[PDB]
Amino acid sequence: SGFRKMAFPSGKVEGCMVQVTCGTTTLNGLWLDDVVYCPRHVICPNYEDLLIRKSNHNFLVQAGNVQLRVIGHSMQNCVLKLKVDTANPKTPKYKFVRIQPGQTFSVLACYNGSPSGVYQCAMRPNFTIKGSFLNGSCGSVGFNIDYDCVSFCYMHHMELPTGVHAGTDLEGNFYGPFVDRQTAQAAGTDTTITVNVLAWLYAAVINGDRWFLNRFTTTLNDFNLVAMKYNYEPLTQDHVDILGPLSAQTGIAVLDMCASLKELLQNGMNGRTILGSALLEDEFTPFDVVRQCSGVTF
Amino acid sequence: SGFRKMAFPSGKVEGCMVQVTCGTTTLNGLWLDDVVYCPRHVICTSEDMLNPNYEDLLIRKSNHNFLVQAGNVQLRVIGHSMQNCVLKLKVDTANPKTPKYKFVRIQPGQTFSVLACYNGSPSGVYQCAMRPNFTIKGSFLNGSCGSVGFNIDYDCVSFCYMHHMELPTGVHAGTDLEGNFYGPFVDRQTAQAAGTDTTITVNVLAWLYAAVINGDRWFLNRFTTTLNDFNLVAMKYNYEPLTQDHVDILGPLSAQTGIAVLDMCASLKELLQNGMNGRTILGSALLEDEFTPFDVVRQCSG
Ligand SMILES: O=C(Nc1cncc2ccc(F)cc12)[C@@H]1CCOc2cc(F)c(Cl)cc21
Ligand SMILES: O=C(Nc1cncc2ccc(F)cc12)[C@@H]1CCOc2cc(F)c(Cl)cc21
Ligand SMILES: [Cl-]
């Protein structure tokens, strides 16, 4: 029993964190095989022109108390790839994956190439992440683990004025309409990840919380009309299919749970809580719920 | 900016998780140097659990009865001893991944990271707090016994908890790494219930200071309170008494934000009285009590 916001074990990623120093800027880099990946803003804009002025010895890479030697450098979108002479002996089995809004991942927050904390979060529908980052956290990475494979999905680049965070996949493509430059940028109006709220309602049922259940069911169209009103993301047939296992396990059809969600949106919780929360939690995917309520290991 | 429930990076602890089997029971063990630590109830059957005599059950066991598996490598047990409710299995190989570590016993209200494991394999990491009733509100399934709670301040792992059991209310009970239970619990299937839980007041105040540091001031008021009047009020909401030690501990946060500890106590009194009125504090509609004053300073400053 119990339901916690749980991150993946960060060990496979910790063995990849290095410090990258260029001029006065110091941030984090991800050392996989003989390449160190980091935000291209470490050289700070015309990034091609700024980069052409740099030599390999301008980039100081530090892996623990060992200085790595940079033997090449290239840019791929908003990520700088520093070729080093030494392949990381701790390189795990990995992939670079681009995630969709609503998908969750673990963030290993780092400062000076040293991991300080791990937390779970979701890529918001507005492509920002509600992270916890201070100055020096750029280059920190987001990831998932699938069996023994680390899927790198995020690299931290910046903080928006509202305190939310923006970054790229490991190929340097930003999530959202953001750019890596000092200019006026604002996150769009955010919405609630509906499939994730439903998955969390199933987790609550699995944990013995049933007060919000009702005898009612709804149509996918009627629920989406209600979801559009309360700034909730539309629920697709794919989402309904994805919630199938949880629906079969609890005996509560997705549209049966949707009618619970609809009543919760129009009436509130009425002093009650669900899994110790007075708000509807949307940062657990259906897969996160099954993984935690079944104990999958890595 | 931002405030998250943040766990310590679990890597130093992952390299210590092993699987311990004794008969039909399989749980997790913590491999540090040449010793594997695990709950002593690994020697029991589900039948023995009502009134086990661990000394009697342990004397009947030999080293080869304990199967220890570190990854795909079977470790050889060369000795065994019991220390309170923990079984210490001496093995023939020192863990090459042994970090710098300490065994620390924590007090209620203290937080720590939990590396949940099944079959000696880590499955997740989350942040926890020792509740005032000495239970932890964890997320644990069958086979999670032996999973550990820890803090990683500096490069040293302070082991503070080993999971032993789930109470009927779904909350969890365990021991420090010396095998001493937190709370009035015993490693027996007898009727045991957690005492009425209360809110960790000093932690809620620390979290209100984290909100101020992050630009949330809506809950502040022009009032102050005596420490005694605050405690008379807070007790009525099932909040732990706030001691002079707690007031002193909140000093740095008070100095940083310019809000006296007793002024923040008056905002808390008002929040208890009024609720949030549709508002949130740091993305939460409830008063969060699983961030210590030390956690707030670490996350907001470094
Ligand atoms: O975003 C940045 N810094 C920080 C990131 N995450 C949390 C931070 C929290 C506080 C803080 F002061 C800096 C934090 C840097 C430095 C400020 O300006 C820019 C502008 C940019 F276009 C880019 Cl791509 C990066 C930055
Ligand atoms: O607590 C136990 N198991 C589990 C622990 N943590 C979450 C669990 C969640 C579910 C579950 F079925 C077992 C879980 C075991 C087996 C049941 O009985 C006892 C009795 C005891 F005296 C002791 Cl010390 C341990 C246990
Ligand atoms: Cl303590």
Query: What are the residue ranges of helices labelled H in chain A?
Result: 11-14, 47-52, 194-206, 220-229, 237-242, 244-250, 254-267, 286-292
- Cβ atoms of B162 and B148 within 8 Å: the answer is yes
Residue type, B87: L
B227 vs B243: CA distance, rounded Å: 8
Between CA A215 and CA A205 the distance in angstroms is 15
B10 vs A contacts (CB less than 8 Å): 9-11, 118
Q: What is the DSSP string of A118-152?
A: EEEEEB-TTS-B-----TT-TT-EEEEEETTEEEE
> Would an 8 Å CB–CB cutoff place B8 in contact with chain A?
yes
Sign of the CA dihedral with B255 first, then B234, B214, and A156 last: positive
- Return the structure tokens found at B87: 């079984």
| Shortest-distance ligand to the CA of residue B139 | 2
Residue type, A37: Y
> What's the reported resolution, in angstroms, to a tenth?
2.0
**Could you tell me which residues are beta bridge partners of residue A159?**
A165
- Can you tell me the distance from the alpha carbon of B127 to that of A290, in angstroms, rounded to the nearest whole number? 20
**Rounded-to-integer distance, Cα A294 and Cα B17, Å:** 19
Sign of the C-alpha dihedral, residues A213, A218, A220, A223?
Answer: negative
Picking from A203, A231, A209, the residue whose alpha carbon sits closest to that of residue A294 is A203
Amino acid at B147: S
Quote the distance between the C-alpha of residue A163 and its chain's center.
16
Q: How far is A123 from chain B (nearest CA, A)?
A: 15
d(CA A49, CA B181): 63
How far apart, in whole angstroms, are the C-alpha atoms of residue A152 and residue A141? Answer: 7
Q: Which residue of A has its CA nearest to B298?
A: A116
Chain A residues whose CB is inside 8 A of the B171 CB are 1-2
What residues of chain B lie within 8 A of the CB of A130, using their CB? 2, 4, 283
Query: Interior CA angle at A169 toward A163 and A171, to 5°?
Result: 140
Cα separation values, B122 from B12, B99, B128, Å: 12, 17, 16
What domains can be seen in chain B, in order of their start residue?
Answer: 1-14+100-197 (2.40.10.10), 15-99 (2.40.10.10), 198-301 (1.10.1840.10)
Whether A293 is catalytic: no
The encoded tokens of residue A26 equal: 């110091």
Ligand 1 near A180 CB (within 6 A): yes
Q: How far is CA A169 from CA A76, A78, A166, B243, in A?
A: 11, 9, 11, 48
> Is the C-beta atom of A209 inside 6 A of ligand 1?
no
Choose the mutation target among B1, B72, B115, B137 for the interface with A, i.e. most A CBs under 10 Å.
B1
Q: Give residue for tokens 């789930």.
A: B166
CB of A184 closer than 6 angstroms to any ligand 1 atom: no
Q: Does ligand 1 have an atom closer than 6 angstroms to the CB of A158?
A: yes
Amino acid at B172: H
Inform me whether the C-beta atom of residue B246 falls under 8 Å from chain A C-beta atoms: no
CB-CB: which of B6, B15, B123 is closest to A119? Answer: B6
User: Any residues with CB less than 8 A from the CB of B197 and at least 6 apart, and which?
Assistant: B131, B132, B133, B135, B238
CB contact under 8 A, A9 and B11: yes
Find the length of chain B: 302
Residue A192, strand partner residues = A232
Residue B241: which H helix or E strand, with range? Answer: none
Return all residues near B43 (Cβ < 8 A) that are at least 6 apart: B22, B23, B25, B54, B57, B58, B61, B87
Which residues does residue A62 pair with via DSSP β-bridges, in sequence order? A19, A67
Strands A149-159 and A93-96: parallel
How many beta-carbon pairs below 8 A join chains A and B?
A: 135
Chain breaks in chain B (C to N over 2.5 A) after: none
Q: Which method was it determined by?
A: X-ray
Task: Report yes or no: A182 and A218 within 8 Å, Cβ to Cβ.
Answer: no
Interface residue B34 vs chain A (CB under 8 A): no
**Residue B188 distance to chain A (closest CA, Å):** 19
Q: Which two tokens stand for residue A19?
A: 């410090």
CB contact under 8 A, A9 and B10: yes
Give one DSSP letter per residue of A56-98, joined into a string: GGGEEEEETTEEEPEEEEEEETTEEEEEESS--TT--EEEE-P
Residue among A119, A270, A296 with most chain B CBs within 10 A, to mutate = A119
Q: Is residue B116 a contact partner of residue B125, using CB atoms and an 8 Å limit?
A: yes
CA distance A155 to A30: 9
Closest residue, chain A, to B141 (C-alpha):
A1
